[PDB]
Protein backbone atom coordinates (compact mmCIF):
# COMPACT_ATOMS: atom_id res chain seq x y z
CA UNK A 1 0.00 0.00 0.00
CA UNK A 2 2.96 2.32 0.62
CA UNK A 3 4.74 1.35 -2.63
CA UNK A 4 1.60 1.05 -4.78
CA UNK A 5 0.05 3.39 -7.35
CA UNK A 6 -3.56 2.75 -8.33
CA UNK A 7 -6.82 4.67 -7.86
CA UNK A 8 -7.20 6.75 -4.72
CA UNK A 9 -4.00 5.22 -3.34
CA UNK A 10 -2.59 8.56 -2.16
CA UNK A 11 -4.85 8.70 0.90
CA UNK A 12 -4.15 5.03 1.63
CA UNK A 13 -0.39 5.61 1.53
CA UNK A 14 -0.73 8.72 3.71
CA UNK A 15 -2.72 6.74 6.28
CA UNK A 16 -0.39 3.72 6.16
CA UNK A 17 3.02 5.43 6.31
CA UNK A 18 2.79 6.27 10.05
CA UNK A 19 2.07 2.66 11.02
CA UNK A 20 4.83 1.28 8.79
CA UNK A 21 7.25 3.78 10.31
CA UNK A 22 6.16 3.07 13.88
CA UNK A 23 6.18 -0.72 13.63
CA UNK A 24 9.99 -0.57 14.07
CA UNK A 25 9.88 1.16 17.49
CA UNK A 26 6.66 -0.04 19.15
CA UNK A 27 8.10 -3.59 19.39
CA UNK A 28 11.40 -2.22 20.71
CA UNK A 29 9.37 -0.06 23.10
CA UNK A 30 7.15 -2.79 24.54
CA UNK A 31 10.14 -5.16 24.68
CA UNK A 32 12.76 -2.95 26.37
CA UNK A 33 11.31 0.23 27.89
CA UNK A 34 8.33 -1.48 29.57
CA UNK A 35 10.35 -4.07 31.56
CA UNK A 36 13.01 -1.51 32.46
CA UNK A 37 10.50 1.09 33.65
CA UNK A 38 8.67 -1.68 35.52
CA UNK A 39 11.75 -2.90 37.41
CA UNK A 40 12.21 0.76 38.42
CA UNK A 41 8.67 0.98 39.88
CA UNK A 42 9.76 1.03 43.54
Amino acid sequence: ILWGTGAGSEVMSRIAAPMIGGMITAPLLSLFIIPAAYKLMW
Partner: protein, 301 residues
Amino acid sequence: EELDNTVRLPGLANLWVPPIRNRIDMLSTGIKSPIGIKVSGTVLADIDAMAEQIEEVARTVPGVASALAERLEGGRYINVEINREKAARYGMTVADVQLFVTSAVGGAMVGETVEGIARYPINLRYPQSWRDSPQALRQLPILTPMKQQITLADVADIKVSTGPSMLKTENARPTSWIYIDARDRDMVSVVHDLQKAIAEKVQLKPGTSVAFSGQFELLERANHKLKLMVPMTLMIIFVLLYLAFRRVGEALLIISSVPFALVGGIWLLWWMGFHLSVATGTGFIALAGVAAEFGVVMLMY
Protein backbone atom coordinates in the same frame (compact mmCIF):
# COMPACT_ATOMS: atom_id res chain seq x y z
CA GLU B 1 4.10 18.46 -18.58
CA GLU B 2 3.90 17.42 -22.24
CA LEU B 3 0.33 18.71 -22.43
CA ASP B 4 1.41 22.09 -21.04
CA ASN B 5 4.40 22.26 -23.39
CA THR B 6 2.25 21.40 -26.43
CA VAL B 7 -0.78 23.68 -26.03
CA ARG B 8 0.59 27.24 -26.30
CA LEU B 9 -1.58 30.09 -27.58
CA PRO B 10 -1.49 33.85 -26.89
CA GLY B 11 -3.95 35.12 -24.31
CA LEU B 12 -4.44 31.84 -22.41
CA ALA B 13 -3.07 30.75 -19.03
CA ASN B 14 -3.26 26.96 -18.90
CA LEU B 15 -4.50 24.99 -15.90
CA TRP B 16 -4.73 21.20 -15.69
CA VAL B 17 -6.99 19.96 -12.89
CA PRO B 18 -9.35 17.06 -12.11
CA PRO B 19 -12.93 17.36 -13.40
CA ILE B 20 -14.58 16.81 -10.01
CA ARG B 21 -12.36 19.34 -8.24
CA ASN B 22 -12.95 21.78 -11.10
CA ARG B 23 -16.73 21.47 -10.76
CA ILE B 24 -16.58 21.78 -6.97
CA ASP B 25 -14.45 24.93 -7.26
CA MET B 26 -16.85 26.35 -9.89
CA LEU B 27 -19.89 25.77 -7.62
CA SER B 28 -17.92 27.19 -4.66
CA THR B 29 -18.79 30.90 -4.91
CA GLY B 30 -16.62 31.92 -1.98
CA ILE B 31 -13.26 33.58 -1.30
CA LYS B 32 -10.13 31.57 -2.09
CA SER B 33 -7.37 33.89 -0.89
CA PRO B 34 -6.34 33.57 2.78
CA ILE B 35 -7.55 37.05 3.82
CA GLY B 36 -10.31 39.06 2.19
CA ILE B 37 -11.43 42.64 2.81
CA LYS B 38 -15.02 43.37 1.77
CA VAL B 39 -15.82 47.05 1.18
CA SER B 40 -19.58 47.58 0.93
CA GLY B 41 -21.43 50.75 -0.02
CA THR B 42 -24.36 52.28 -1.89
CA VAL B 43 -22.67 52.68 -5.30
CA LEU B 44 -19.68 51.25 -7.15
CA ALA B 45 -17.59 54.40 -7.59
CA ASP B 46 -17.07 55.16 -3.89
CA ILE B 47 -16.25 51.58 -2.93
CA ASP B 48 -13.85 51.28 -5.88
CA ALA B 49 -12.07 54.50 -4.92
CA MET B 50 -11.86 53.30 -1.31
CA ALA B 51 -10.44 49.92 -2.32
CA GLU B 52 -7.88 51.69 -4.50
CA GLN B 53 -6.50 53.20 -1.27
CA ILE B 54 -6.97 50.16 0.99
CA GLU B 55 -4.84 48.25 -1.53
CA GLU B 56 -1.68 50.25 -0.85
CA VAL B 57 -2.66 50.72 2.81
CA ALA B 58 -2.55 46.94 3.31
CA ARG B 59 0.42 46.42 0.97
CA THR B 60 2.61 48.51 3.30
CA VAL B 61 2.16 46.59 6.58
CA PRO B 62 4.82 43.96 7.40
CA GLY B 63 4.15 40.75 5.49
CA VAL B 64 3.86 39.70 1.85
CA ALA B 65 0.46 40.89 0.59
CA SER B 66 -0.33 40.72 -3.14
CA ALA B 67 -3.21 43.15 -2.74
CA LEU B 68 -5.22 43.05 -5.98
CA ALA B 69 -8.23 45.37 -6.22
CA GLU B 70 -10.36 43.50 -8.77
CA ARG B 71 -10.42 42.12 -12.33
CA LEU B 72 -14.00 43.19 -13.12
CA GLU B 73 -13.44 46.39 -15.12
CA GLY B 74 -12.92 44.75 -18.50
CA GLY B 75 -16.03 45.51 -20.53
CA ARG B 76 -16.26 47.76 -23.57
CA TYR B 77 -19.38 49.79 -24.29
CA ILE B 78 -21.00 51.86 -27.04
CA ASN B 79 -23.23 54.28 -25.12
CA VAL B 80 -26.17 55.76 -27.03
CA GLU B 81 -27.12 58.74 -24.87
CA ILE B 82 -30.75 59.65 -25.59
CA ASN B 83 -31.49 63.38 -25.36
CA ARG B 84 -35.00 64.16 -24.14
CA GLU B 85 -35.13 67.56 -25.87
CA LYS B 86 -34.08 66.34 -29.32
CA ALA B 87 -36.44 63.39 -28.85
CA ALA B 88 -39.35 65.67 -27.92
CA ARG B 89 -38.64 67.84 -30.97
CA TYR B 90 -39.98 64.93 -33.06
CA GLY B 91 -42.59 63.75 -30.56
CA MET B 92 -40.92 60.49 -29.47
CA THR B 93 -40.52 59.66 -25.79
CA VAL B 94 -37.53 57.75 -24.44
CA ALA B 95 -39.43 54.47 -24.81
CA ASP B 96 -40.12 55.31 -28.46
CA VAL B 97 -36.37 55.22 -29.12
CA GLN B 98 -35.67 52.28 -26.80
CA LEU B 99 -38.19 50.31 -28.88
CA PHE B 100 -36.00 50.72 -31.97
CA VAL B 101 -32.86 50.14 -29.90
CA THR B 102 -34.04 46.78 -28.56
CA SER B 103 -36.12 45.55 -31.52
CA ALA B 104 -34.45 46.88 -34.67
CA VAL B 105 -30.91 46.49 -33.31
CA GLY B 106 -31.36 44.15 -30.34
CA GLY B 107 -33.65 41.56 -31.90
CA ALA B 108 -35.78 40.44 -28.98
CA MET B 109 -38.22 37.54 -29.03
CA VAL B 110 -41.76 38.41 -30.14
CA GLY B 111 -43.40 34.99 -30.04
CA GLU B 112 -42.91 31.24 -30.28
CA THR B 113 -44.04 28.81 -32.97
CA VAL B 114 -45.41 25.48 -31.73
CA GLU B 115 -44.56 22.30 -33.66
CA GLY B 116 -46.06 19.71 -31.34
CA ILE B 117 -44.22 19.50 -28.02
CA ALA B 118 -41.45 21.86 -29.16
CA ARG B 119 -41.37 25.66 -29.22
CA TYR B 120 -39.13 27.70 -31.50
CA PRO B 121 -38.66 31.44 -30.85
CA ILE B 122 -39.40 34.23 -33.31
CA ASN B 123 -36.96 37.08 -33.94
CA LEU B 124 -37.69 40.50 -35.44
CA ARG B 125 -34.66 42.53 -36.48
CA TYR B 126 -33.13 44.88 -39.03
CA PRO B 127 -30.62 43.76 -41.67
CA GLN B 128 -26.94 43.38 -40.87
CA SER B 129 -25.92 46.32 -43.06
CA TRP B 130 -27.69 48.85 -40.80
CA ARG B 131 -26.34 47.60 -37.44
CA ASP B 132 -22.70 46.80 -38.22
CA SER B 133 -20.74 49.55 -36.43
CA PRO B 134 -21.37 52.69 -34.34
CA GLN B 135 -21.19 54.73 -37.55
CA ALA B 136 -24.06 52.57 -38.82
CA LEU B 137 -26.05 53.15 -35.62
CA ARG B 138 -25.58 56.91 -36.05
CA GLN B 139 -27.50 56.54 -39.34
CA LEU B 140 -30.17 54.08 -38.17
CA PRO B 141 -33.43 55.11 -39.90
CA ILE B 142 -36.31 55.82 -37.52
CA LEU B 143 -39.99 56.48 -38.27
CA THR B 144 -41.59 58.88 -35.80
CA PRO B 145 -45.20 58.42 -34.63
CA MET B 146 -46.22 61.12 -37.14
CA LYS B 147 -44.52 59.16 -39.96
CA GLN B 148 -41.42 61.36 -40.23
CA GLN B 149 -38.11 60.08 -41.59
CA ILE B 150 -35.15 60.81 -39.30
CA THR B 151 -32.00 59.08 -38.06
CA LEU B 152 -30.79 57.97 -34.64
CA ALA B 153 -28.06 60.62 -34.36
CA ASP B 154 -30.78 63.30 -34.34
CA VAL B 155 -32.24 62.24 -30.96
CA ALA B 156 -29.19 60.69 -29.28
CA ASP B 157 -25.40 60.68 -29.14
CA ILE B 158 -23.46 57.44 -29.64
CA LYS B 159 -20.17 57.19 -27.73
CA VAL B 160 -17.71 54.38 -27.03
CA SER B 161 -16.25 53.66 -23.59
CA THR B 162 -15.26 50.87 -21.19
CA GLY B 163 -16.90 49.22 -18.21
CA PRO B 164 -17.38 46.09 -16.11
CA SER B 165 -17.78 42.56 -17.43
CA MET B 166 -19.54 41.23 -14.31
CA LEU B 167 -21.15 42.85 -11.27
CA LYS B 168 -20.85 41.35 -7.79
CA THR B 169 -23.34 42.02 -5.00
CA GLU B 170 -22.84 40.97 -1.37
CA ASN B 171 -26.02 41.15 0.72
CA ALA B 172 -27.77 43.22 -1.97
CA ARG B 173 -25.11 45.95 -1.92
CA PRO B 174 -22.31 46.86 -4.36
CA THR B 175 -19.22 45.30 -2.79
CA SER B 176 -15.52 45.36 -3.66
CA TRP B 177 -13.21 42.49 -2.67
CA ILE B 178 -9.52 42.83 -1.81
CA TYR B 179 -7.32 39.73 -1.54
CA ILE B 180 -4.39 39.60 0.90
CA ASP B 181 -2.44 36.34 0.71
CA ALA B 182 0.56 34.67 2.34
CA ARG B 183 1.94 31.14 2.71
CA ASP B 184 3.33 28.87 5.42
CA ARG B 185 2.17 31.12 8.25
CA ASP B 186 -0.91 31.56 10.42
CA MET B 187 -2.74 34.83 9.70
CA VAL B 188 -3.93 35.41 13.25
CA SER B 189 -2.06 38.60 14.22
CA VAL B 190 -1.74 40.44 10.90
CA VAL B 191 -5.53 40.89 10.76
CA HIS B 192 -5.51 43.15 13.83
CA ASP B 193 -2.63 45.28 12.54
CA LEU B 194 -4.33 45.59 9.15
CA GLN B 195 -7.61 46.66 10.75
CA LYS B 196 -5.81 49.21 12.93
CA ALA B 197 -3.90 50.67 9.98
CA ILE B 198 -7.06 50.87 7.87
CA ALA B 199 -9.04 52.55 10.65
CA GLU B 200 -6.23 55.05 11.34
CA LYS B 201 -4.91 56.00 7.88
CA VAL B 202 -8.16 55.66 5.89
CA GLN B 203 -11.43 57.60 6.11
CA LEU B 204 -14.85 56.14 5.31
CA LYS B 205 -17.32 57.96 3.08
CA PRO B 206 -20.95 58.39 4.17
CA GLY B 207 -22.64 55.06 3.55
CA THR B 208 -19.63 52.75 3.35
CA SER B 209 -18.37 49.94 5.58
CA VAL B 210 -15.46 47.50 5.64
CA ALA B 211 -15.20 43.94 6.93
CA PHE B 212 -12.64 41.14 7.07
CA SER B 213 -13.03 37.43 6.35
CA GLY B 214 -11.22 34.42 4.92
CA GLN B 215 -10.24 30.87 5.79
CA PHE B 216 -8.64 31.93 9.08
CA GLU B 217 -12.11 32.80 10.45
CA LEU B 218 -12.88 29.07 10.58
CA LEU B 219 -9.42 27.88 11.67
CA GLU B 220 -9.38 29.91 14.89
CA ARG B 221 -12.65 28.12 15.68
CA ALA B 222 -11.86 24.56 14.60
CA ASN B 223 -8.46 24.35 16.31
CA HIS B 224 -10.01 25.78 19.48
CA LYS B 225 -12.69 23.09 19.62
CA LEU B 226 -9.98 20.46 19.12
CA LYS B 227 -8.11 21.68 22.20
CA LEU B 228 -11.33 21.07 24.16
CA MET B 229 -11.61 17.39 23.18
CA VAL B 230 -7.92 16.39 23.11
CA PRO B 231 -7.67 16.48 26.94
CA MET B 232 -11.11 14.93 27.43
CA THR B 233 -10.13 11.96 25.25
CA LEU B 234 -6.99 11.34 27.32
CA MET B 235 -9.13 11.51 30.46
CA ILE B 236 -11.62 8.96 29.12
CA ILE B 237 -8.59 6.84 28.24
CA PHE B 238 -6.83 7.17 31.61
CA VAL B 239 -9.96 6.21 33.57
CA LEU B 240 -9.95 3.02 31.48
CA LEU B 241 -6.27 2.12 31.89
CA TYR B 242 -6.63 2.51 35.66
CA LEU B 243 -9.63 0.17 35.62
CA ALA B 244 -7.45 -2.33 33.75
CA PHE B 245 -4.67 -2.28 36.37
CA ARG B 246 -6.31 -0.67 39.44
CA ARG B 247 -3.06 1.29 39.77
CA VAL B 248 -1.98 4.66 38.42
CA GLY B 249 1.65 3.71 37.81
CA GLU B 250 0.97 1.43 34.85
CA ALA B 251 -1.45 3.87 33.21
CA LEU B 252 1.02 6.75 33.52
CA LEU B 253 3.82 4.52 32.22
CA ILE B 254 1.83 3.51 29.13
CA ILE B 255 0.71 7.08 28.42
CA SER B 256 4.32 8.29 28.75
CA SER B 257 5.70 5.44 26.62
CA VAL B 258 3.27 5.80 23.69
CA PRO B 259 5.24 8.89 22.57
CA PHE B 260 8.11 6.55 21.66
CA ALA B 261 5.91 4.67 19.18
CA LEU B 262 4.65 8.04 17.94
CA VAL B 263 8.28 9.09 17.37
CA GLY B 264 9.03 5.90 15.46
CA GLY B 265 5.96 6.50 13.32
CA ILE B 266 6.62 10.16 12.55
CA TRP B 267 10.30 9.57 11.73
CA LEU B 268 9.26 7.96 8.42
CA LEU B 269 7.14 10.76 6.93
CA TRP B 270 10.24 12.91 6.41
CA TRP B 271 12.08 10.18 4.50
CA MET B 272 8.93 9.46 2.48
CA GLY B 273 8.50 13.15 1.66
CA PHE B 274 4.80 13.27 2.54
CA HIS B 275 3.04 16.00 4.51
CA LEU B 276 1.09 15.69 7.75
CA SER B 277 -2.69 16.10 7.58
CA VAL B 278 -5.82 14.59 9.13
CA ALA B 279 -5.07 11.28 7.39
CA THR B 280 -1.65 11.17 9.04
CA GLY B 281 -3.49 12.06 12.25
CA THR B 282 -5.68 8.97 12.03
CA GLY B 283 -2.58 6.95 11.16
CA PHE B 284 -0.77 8.18 14.27
CA ILE B 285 -3.85 7.53 16.41
CA ALA B 286 -4.04 3.94 15.17
CA LEU B 287 -0.30 3.50 15.77
CA ALA B 288 -0.66 4.82 19.33
CA GLY B 289 -3.60 2.47 19.90
CA VAL B 290 -1.63 -0.57 18.76
CA ALA B 291 1.34 0.54 20.88
CA ALA B 292 -0.88 0.88 23.96
CA GLU B 293 -2.30 -2.58 23.24
CA PHE B 294 1.23 -4.00 23.10
CA GLY B 295 2.14 -2.22 26.32
CA VAL B 296 -0.92 -3.49 28.19
CA VAL B 297 -0.47 -7.08 27.01
CA MET B 298 3.19 -6.88 28.04
CA LEU B 299 2.53 -5.39 31.48
CA MET B 300 -0.11 -8.04 32.20
CA TYR B 301 2.40 -10.82 31.53
